[PDB]
A paper describes a structure:
Here, we showed three complex structures of 6mA demethylase [name] [name]-1A, a canonical isoform of [name] ([name]). [name], one of the AlkB family members in [name], demethylates the DNA damage modification such as 6mA and 3mC. [name] [name]-1A protein has 291 residues involving an N-terminal extension (NTE), a nucleotide-recognition lid (NRL), a DSBH domain, and the CTD. Like other AlkB family proteins, [name]-1A requires the binding of the cosubstrate α-KG and ferrous iron for catalysis.
Here, we show three [name] canonical isoform [name]-1A crystal structures with different ligands, including Mn2+/α-KG, Mn2+, or SO42−. These structures present a conventional and conserved double-stranded β-helix (DSBH) consistent with multiple unique structural features of a stretch-out Flip2 motif and a functionally indispensable carboxy-terminal domain (CTD). Finally, we chose to engineer [name]-1A with site-directed mutagenesis to increase the binding ability of [name]-1A to nucleic acids, thus making protein crystallization easier. We then expressed and purified these [name]-1A mutants involving three mutations (E109K, Q112K, Q114K) separately or jointly from the Flip1 region and determined their binding ability to different short nucleotides using FPLC. Next, we collected the peaks of the protein and nucleotide complex for crystallization. In addition, the main chains of Asp-186, Met-188, and Ile-190 in the structures containing the CTD further moved into the active center 2.3 Å, 2.7 Å, and 4.1 Å, respectively. In addition, SAXS analysis showed that [name]-1A existed mainly in the form of monomer in solution. Hence, four copies of [name]-1A found in each asymmetric unit were due to the crystal packing. Moreover, the positions of the L3 are the same between the determined three [name]-1A structures and are probably fixed by forming interactions with the DSBH domain.
Numbering used by the authors: 34 to 288
Write the structure that this text describes.
């Protein structure tokens, strides 16, 4: 990635990013996981907080994951870029031409209610009051060298909060503040949830590197209504209200 950047590591316990010179642009997953444990004993000097980075360890039980995954695998997996394969329960959108098509959007997966309810329980303010606009499951495999390029998700139809859930196996999220020249690594463990919002959503860029992917990982990705497409917004009548109605619909996957 970027050699000149200052590398940081995330302490889940302290909810801060701690500066590390033992970690680098090409650092291995194992090194980042060990630093995640060894950053918990370091001073707060030079430490930074990325607002909107919320990592919940153990969001889903083995039992809860088993039900969601069996429903996911029965559904077909589509081709995608960068070694990824995808299942998209969302509208078809041309971000450049601001066009939304609801032809392929039938609703949201039946497991959605459980995930949304649990997010509200942990924090109603932080993860509650979420209306699903897109729920996309992404397949990453070490053999296929799957990865996602450093990026900021579109902010026109997708809202402040972006949710990624690590299924089957965990990974590391690399976050880049190009202007501030800061690189941070967030280790998302198995059955964990990440919400990227606020500074993380707009100021920082998010990507999953190939060397940080082991075995097969499925990202259950969720997106929320942009305020413009929501009630009290310009596009609600043209596009948002239908999208809320379709998102309220649940596709039966059990079966
Ligand atoms: Cl799979
Ligand atoms: Cl992503
Ligand atoms: Mn993204």
């Amino acid at each position: 990635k970027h050699v000149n950047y200052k590398v940081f590591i995330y302490d889940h316990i302290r909810q801060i990013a701690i500066p590390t010179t033992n970690l680098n642009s090409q650092s291995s997953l194992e090194d980042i996981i060990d630093e995640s444990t060894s950053c918990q004993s370091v001073s707060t000097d030079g430490s930074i907080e990325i607002d909107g980075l919320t990592l919940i360890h153990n969001f889903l039980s083995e039992s809860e994951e088993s039900k969601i995954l069996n429903m996911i695998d029965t559904v077909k997996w589509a081709k995608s870029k960068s070694g990824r394969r995808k299942q998209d329960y969302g509208p078809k959108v041309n971000f450049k031409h601001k066009k939304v098509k609801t032809d392929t959007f039938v609703g949201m997966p039946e497991y959605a209610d459980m995930l949304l309810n649990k997010m509200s329980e942990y924090d109603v303010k932080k993860l509650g009051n979420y209306q699903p606009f897109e729920m996309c499951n992404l397949e990453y495999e070490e053999v296929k060298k799957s990865a996602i390029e450093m990026h900021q998700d579109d902010m026109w139809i997708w809202g402040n909060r972006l949710i990624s859930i690590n299924l089957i196996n965990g990974s590391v999220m690399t976050l880049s503040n190009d202007n501030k020249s800061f690189l941070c690594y967030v280790h998302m463990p198995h059955r964990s949830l990440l919400c990227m919002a606020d500074e993380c959503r707009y100021d920082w860029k998010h990507g999953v590197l190939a060397h940080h992917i082991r075995g097969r990982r499925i990202a259950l990705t969720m997106r929320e209504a942009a305020k413009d497409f929501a009630e009290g917004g310009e596009l609600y009548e043209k596009y948002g209200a239908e999208l809320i109605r379709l998102g309220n619909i649940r596709v039966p996957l059990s079966k």
